[PDB]
């Protein structure tokens, strides 16, 4: 087509979705991780994660307001990844990289799994 | 902080939200324009438009599944703006610029109003 494009549009949308998350506006699901609870928007979770995409396209699970993650999932690793979903920023540190990579593999967040693999390989 | 950032994350999120819109997955509102109906996600509409932000933060209207726009709003202008919300791409043409600008002013989409004003000024 002959469209024009606003460069900052996608980033501004994500910033506003994160503002809605901060203020708990229109959040429609609780993600339970080892008794730690995280409120979010199903659509943002689906847009970021192959696991959430699969969960919320399921005809029964799409209607659930609570999702319990596997007990092996670390709440801090999940928190870091949820923040990344809403900001594009990943707080990757020596002390959390193993939990973050394991959580990203479970959530099916391929680009995160990729940078974790590379950061681990650089330290070996 | 010491975060790393994935450059394409925001664009990939928006692309996935538009794929959900195309497939009518988790859409939670119908926008009615001169008897033309558009399904969308409230959170994306709020992230893009000052009007929808105001509507869906209202304690009564946040729960509505149907929103009727002012009868002066042109369905094609709305359609072009809804596409822009989900893609960052604006189909601005000589034949639609007046309807698009009027719709963007009503929806409170300041960057769109800005490029319409500039494109109109260039032709005068």
């Amino acid at each position: 087509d002959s469209c024009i494009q606003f460069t900052r549009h996608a980033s501004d949308v994500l910033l506003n979705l994160n503002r809605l998350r901060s203020r708990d506006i229109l959040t429609d699901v609780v993600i339970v991780v080892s008794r730690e609870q995280f409120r979010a928007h199903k659509t943002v979770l689906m847009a970021c994660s192959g696991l959430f995409y699969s969960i919320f396209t399921d005809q029964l699970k799409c209607n659930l307001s609570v999702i319990n993650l596997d007990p092996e999932i670390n709440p801090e690793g999940f928190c870091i990844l949820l923040d990344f979903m809403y900001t594009s920023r990943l707080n990757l540190r020596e002390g959390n990289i193993m939990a973050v990579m394991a959580t990203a593999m479970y959530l099916q967040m391929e680009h995160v799994v990729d940078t974790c693999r590379k950061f681990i390989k650089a330290s070996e | 902080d010491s975060c790393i950032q994935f450059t394409r994350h925001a664009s990939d999120v928006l692309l996935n939200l538009n794929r959900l819109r195309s497939r009518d997955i988790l859409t939670d509102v119908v926008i009615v324009v001169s008897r033309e109906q558009f399904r969308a996600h409230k959170t994306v509409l709020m992230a893009c438009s000052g009007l929808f932000y105001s509507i869906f933060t209202d304690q009564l209207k946040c729960n509505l599944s149907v929103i009727n726009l002012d009868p002066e709003i042109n369905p094609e202008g709305f359609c072009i703006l809804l596409d822009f919300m989900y893609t960052s791409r604006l189909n601005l043409r000589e034949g639609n610029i007046m309807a698009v600008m009027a719709t963007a002013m009503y929806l409170q989409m300041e960057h769109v109003v800005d490029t319409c004003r500039k494109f109109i000024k260039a032709s005068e």
């Binding site: 469209c3 024009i4 494009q5 606003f6 460069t7 | 791409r89 604006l90 960057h111 490029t115």
Partner: peptide
């Protein structure tokens, strides 16, 4: 705004 740009030409994509």
């Amino acid at each position: 705004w740009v030409i994509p």
